[PDB]
Nucleic acid binder design. Structure first.
Ligand SMILES: N=C1c2cccnc2N(O)C(=O)C1C(=O)NCc1ccc(F)cc1F
Ligand SMILES: N=C1c2cccnc2N(O)C(=O)C1C(=O)NCc1ccc(F)cc1F
Ligand SMILES: [Mg+2]
Ligand SMILES: [Mg+2]
Ligand SMILES: [Mg+2]
Ligand SMILES: [Mg+2]
Ligand SMILES: [Zn+2]
Ligand SMILES: [Zn+2]
Lengths: 183, 367, 367, 183
DNA sequence: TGCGAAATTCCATGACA
DNA sequence: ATTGTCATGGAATTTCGCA
DNA sequence: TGCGAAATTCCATGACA
DNA sequence: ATTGTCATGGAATTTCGCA
């Protein structure tokens, strides 16, 4: 079989609803299966319309052969199926109530949830401005299995923003108190 | 009188040849030369004569001399003509140069992607969805280009667009021209926060941003073709143009900007499949080899009458937006430092230090 | 299928070389070439493939082929690519030329003064006494120039000025560009009443009025110098500039325009006195000898990739005032007649006959 | 002595007052002594101001060494003397009540008076527009003494407007009736 | 029939919206 | 049915002054 | 080891306000 | 303290297919 490559498979999913940040409530997460490279797009709803708008930005940079998702309404709609067919993108769905992707992607989606939670507390309405530095952090994170970061696997070079000081990613005991106060 | 008095009685003076007869007539010293009888004025009158002749139409060397030679003769006339040409402030700042700039430098291609971005604005364009301008960002090594529509060429719109772009990666250097959006302190503050060094072209010299300027040509050219026989609704086409140009082959390179950035085509039409059986690490090894071996042009031959700047030389900077019937050149300034054969620092007409391209300089004539 | 069916079983077809093995795989005819395994599409699919590849970014020959070659191979691919390039209307009218115009003609200097006037307007200038423009009239043989300030570049102001000028003498020909003041029927009527033939430059080509254009440079240059450090009160200076330039030597000719017109200097500074002992008839005889023996330049060498027009050739006229994101060239037209190597008549995109300079034409690419 | 040349001597004089023609009442006549070439300038008055304005036009084409005139007020003024000195022009005056110039110039000034009179009758307020064709006629008139016209002596070429049909210059008997009617 | 310096000619450069 | 031009100042070439 | 044709490389031209 | 660039299509050169 052929070796796995970037742009073979994008894994997409929505995170939210989040507290409002400059109008936006959700985050469309896109992860390249081979590299682990992550793109994050803020949206006002988990709709087909918002998915098409965000992915039109990404697919003007690079088009995947396959998009993988759960059976969410925005991804199973006939409008999104028509959008994917126009661009030659095969859609691939996991079984309902049994979401599966890959170890690398599962752990990347785990990192994204916990990194967002850790930066949400203290400033929960200001995550729109932090999405750039979140992506840079995620994409310059050292991989245990593979030798390289997602940035290195996608571009074939070292980055100008290496994150050597590895953030703990767990919440400190004081951050648990302020997180438990609101909701 | 003193010098000309000894000439009349017959003695030799240096400069005045012996074989012609010098005589007095109508109270004036004269000489019979092959052209005719010319008046020899005294030394103390010659600067005034050269000036009166020059000031008729502020003529150059030969046209000024041809006026003087109608009436007068004296030794080394053009030397006195050239002395006045180099002292006439009006001629120095109004006349054109007749020496071309030295041949252009072809600076090295940046070694890696994200080493150097070139950014610039296009516009104003016809209004499309309320948008008038396009921010164009070109990676120097790959030529990979990002397009962002804006309502003005502002610092705020530049910062919003680059915050989206820098989600992918941060560059070492951003090169731009001296437009208002890029020279403001707000933008320098934005770059220092992210460890980005801001590099600026010499003023009024878009050659220096030539990487992104040339891409602007391709962007406008494709947009023009796509909009033939249609209203100029270019806002919806920017994503299409961005993708189309990023996957267009350069015939001299044999690669697309997408291929130089990623080392593999995405799911676009006519994707190259030569590295299908290679692993990604084998693919990235071939990509490092491809990046280093790209064709790079060399400095062309100098034109037969070019000038190159020297430290201490008198040079004049071009006036930027010269008003009607006003000089095209500033007053003479001195070359402090030669940064490269095409770029210098000068001690300006105001007193400031200024870094300029020699394309916006002429060497001051007559030393 | 028919052509490719015989290829699979082993027979020879012209265009397809024998030394490579052609086979079937996934329902498609393929071939193993040194670059890799390529698909051979049937004849009936190739025009669609070339078009799909070209239309990605409307690329030229090599950049379009490099896309096709990633997947496909067939005999003489560039021939099918070039066929589509010559049929793509968007590329033909949007792309630039890469062939320079043939070398310029240096038409003969008019034999006599008043044989041909060259007229043109300068302006708008800064308001001076209510005046904004200058009518410039240059005699072709002598270079003798008349200046007239006007409030607009109008036919009425042109007629008033030339009525004053033609008090001295009537010209055979007046050459002008196609500005509104000179193309109006009122001006043609004024010229026919006086037996003056109106000659017009090809459109959008001030080279053709180069005699008066070059004089405009000298007029503005001297005015600029005289107005240094002063408000731009140029109305009172036009008589001074006219006299100064009419008595300025041309270094290559060795004569002033005044001298070529009258054969003797008037009471201006530094008047030439070489013909003082001659009679006027002897002076006018020397003037006829001087007029015929003036230096005349010759056509320069053609550039290494220039084109010259041929009858029946497809050419495209440049768009005059092209709007933003619109093509720079009109649709192809045919050369009816070749007036000279630099000037042609074409059957225009509308249907009209039109006389144009080749500087405003490109040869249509791909025949 | 040196042969006579163009621009050696301009002969100037005023003709008028004439009937009004687009504001103008007088004509400043300038005749080159050597060639007989004539310049005509319309003026509103026989003043120094009007003389300086008209001659500033002529002297932007060519400057004479000498200007000759009668002792008219406009020519004997200190302002006109200052104007001439600025341009290196020597002024030369005839004796009062004894105007003299040259045979060629006297006959040229005669031609101008009679040619103006002949075109004045019938259209006496429209002589401003006819001054161009009057000059062309005068300057392409064959000289009896010299072989050539003024145009030929000044420029050294034939003209594009030769006046072969020599006008009679005398008034017809019908033109005497309309001339004697008004004044 | 030859030298050093001055005078002349050559001509690439650039700007006429 | 129309078409480049020419002032400018360093450099290249020719002429001049003297022997 | 050499031919005719196709494929590739060369590179002057022009436009990015 | 900074620096031209490169798509384009005829032409020139090299390679290919065959012998
Ligand atoms: N004048 C400009 C400008 C002024 C202020 C700000 N931005 C500017 N930009 O971006 C430009 O591109 C300008 C321009 O003239 N471009 C044309 C052009 C000419 C020559 C060349 F080699 C390259 C090239 F792009
Ligand atoms: N565009 C012009 C124009 C348009 C309409 C009417 N009159 C015009 N005139 O008189 C011009 O001079 C115009 C012009 O561009 N001149 C600049 C110029 C460029 C190149 C060249 F070889 C000579 C040259 F003078
Ligand atoms: Mg800019
Ligand atoms: Mg630009
Ligand atoms: Mg014009
Ligand atoms: Mg013009
Ligand atoms: Zn000057
Ligand atoms: Zn096309």
């Amino acid at each position: 079989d052929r070796p796995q490559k970037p742009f073979d498979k994008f894994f997409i999913d929505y995170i939210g609803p989040l507290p409002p940040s400059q109008g936006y409530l959700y985050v469309l997460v896109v992860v390249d299966g081979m590299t682990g490279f992550t793109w994050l797009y803020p949206t006002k709803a988990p709709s087909t319309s918002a998915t098409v708008k965000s992915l039109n930005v990404l697919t003007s940079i690079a088009i995947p052969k396959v998009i993988h998702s759960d059976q969410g309404a925005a991804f199973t709609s006939s409008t999104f199926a028509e959008w994917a067919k126009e661009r030659g993108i095969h859609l691939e769905f996991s079984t309902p109530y049994h979401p599966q992707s890959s170890g690398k992607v599962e752990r990347k989606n785990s990192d994204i949830k916990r990194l967002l939670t850790k930066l949400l507390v203290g400033r929960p309405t200001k995550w729109y401005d932090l999405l750039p530095v979140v992506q840079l952090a995620l994409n310059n994170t050292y991989s245990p299995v593979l030798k390289y970061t997602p940035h290195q696997l996608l571009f074939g070079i070292d980055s100008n923003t290496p994150f050597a000081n590895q953030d703990t990613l767990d919440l400190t005991r004081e951050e648990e108190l302020s997180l438990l106060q609101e909701i | 009188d003193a010098e000309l008095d000894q000439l009349l009685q017959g003695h030799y003076i240096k400069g005045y040849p012996k074989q012609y007869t010098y005589f007095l007539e109508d109270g004036k010293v004269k000489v019979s030369r092959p052209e005719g009888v010319k008046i020899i004025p005294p030394q103390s009158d010659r600067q005034k004569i050269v000036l009166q002749a020059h000031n008729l139409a502020h003529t150059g060397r030969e046209a000024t001399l041809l006026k003087i030679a109608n009436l007068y003769w004296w030794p080394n006339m053009r030397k006195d003509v050239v002395k006045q040409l180099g002292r006439c402030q009006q001629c120095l700042i109004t006349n054109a140069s007749n020496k071309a700039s030295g041949p252009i430098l072809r600076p090295d291609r940046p070694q890696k992607p994200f080493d150097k971005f070139f950014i610039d604005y296009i516009g104003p364009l016809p209004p499309s969805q309320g948008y008038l301008y396009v921010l164009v960002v070109v990676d120097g090594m790959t030529g990979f280009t990002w397009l962002y529509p804006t309502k003005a060429p502002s610092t705020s719109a530049t910062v919003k667009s680059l915050n989206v772009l820098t989600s992918i990666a941060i560059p070492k250097v951003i090169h731009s021209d001296q437009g208002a959006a890029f020279t403001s302190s707000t933008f320098a503050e934005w770059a220092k926060e992210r460890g980005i060094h801001l590099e600026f072209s010499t003023p009024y010299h878009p050659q220096s941003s030539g990487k992104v300027e040339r891409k602007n040509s391709d962007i406008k050219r494709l947009l023009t073709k796509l909009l033939v026989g249609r209203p100029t609704k270019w806002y919806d086409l920017l994503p299409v143009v961005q993708l189309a140009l990023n996957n267009t082959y350069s015939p001299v390179l044999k690669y697309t900007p997408h291929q130089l950035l990623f080392g593999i085509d995405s799911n676009t039409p006519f994707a190259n499949q030569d590295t299908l059986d290679l692993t990604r690490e084998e693919e990235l090894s071939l990509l490092q080899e491809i990046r280093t071996s790209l064709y790079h042009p060399s400095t062309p031959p100098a034109s037969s009458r070019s000038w190159s700047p020297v430290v201490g030389q008198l040079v004049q900077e071009r006036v930027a937006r010269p008003a009607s019937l006003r000089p095209r050149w500033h007053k003479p300034s001195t070359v402090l430092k030669v940064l490269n054969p095409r770029t210098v620092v000068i001690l300006d007409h105001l007193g400031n230090n200024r870094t300029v391209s020699i394309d916006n300089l002429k060497p001051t004539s007559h030393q």
